[PDB]
Amino acid sequence: PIASAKVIEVELNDDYFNPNVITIPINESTTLLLKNKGKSEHTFTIKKLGIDVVVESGKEKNITVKPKSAGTYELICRYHLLKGMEGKVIVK
């Protein structure tokens, strides 16, 4: 079976998501390698896509997103711990 269409490393830390703007292809599977390098637990949350993944400090999760709808969607940490409020997932 076939590889994901795209693979993106995403750092979660105590200050920001890196990258904070993630662009992914519509109607395809993208693997997101989430790595929490902070001391706190953090969430990776895209409410409109039904994504809410919790990553403990020092842990990692390799998730798959398969978005259905072109658009720009807010990416947040639900705990409201990060320095800014500008995160986005763009589907095209």
Indicate the domain borders of the chain. 1-92
In the PDB record, what is the listed experimental method? X-ray
Tokens 């703007």: give the residue: 21
Q: CA torsion angle for 41, 36, 65, 46 (degrees, to 10)?
A: 40
Q: Find out whether 77 is annotated in a ligand binding site.
A: yes
- DSSP 3-state assignment of 49? helix
Q: Find out whether 60 is annotated in a ligand binding site.
A: no
Q: Which CATH number fits domain 1-92: 3.30.420.40, 3.30.450.40, 2.60.40.420, 3.40.50.2000?
A: 2.60.40.420
Q: Find out whether 35 is annotated in a ligand binding site.
A: no
12: how many CB neighbours lie within 10 A of its CB? 26
CA distance 89 to 69: 11
Q: What are phi and psi of 70, to 5 degrees?
A: -65, 140
Q: Find out whether 66 is annotated in a ligand binding site.
A: no
- DSSP 3-state assignment of 16? coil
Q: Find out whether 37 is annotated in a ligand binding site.
A: no
Over the range 29-66, which residues count as b (16 or more CB within 10 Å of their CB) and which as e? bbebebbbebeebbbbbbeebebeebbeeeeebeeebe
19: how many CB neighbours lie within 10 A of its CB? 14
Resolution expressed in Å: 1.5
Query: If you count them, how many residues does the chain have?
Result: 92
Q: Find out whether 80 is annotated in a ligand binding site.
A: yes
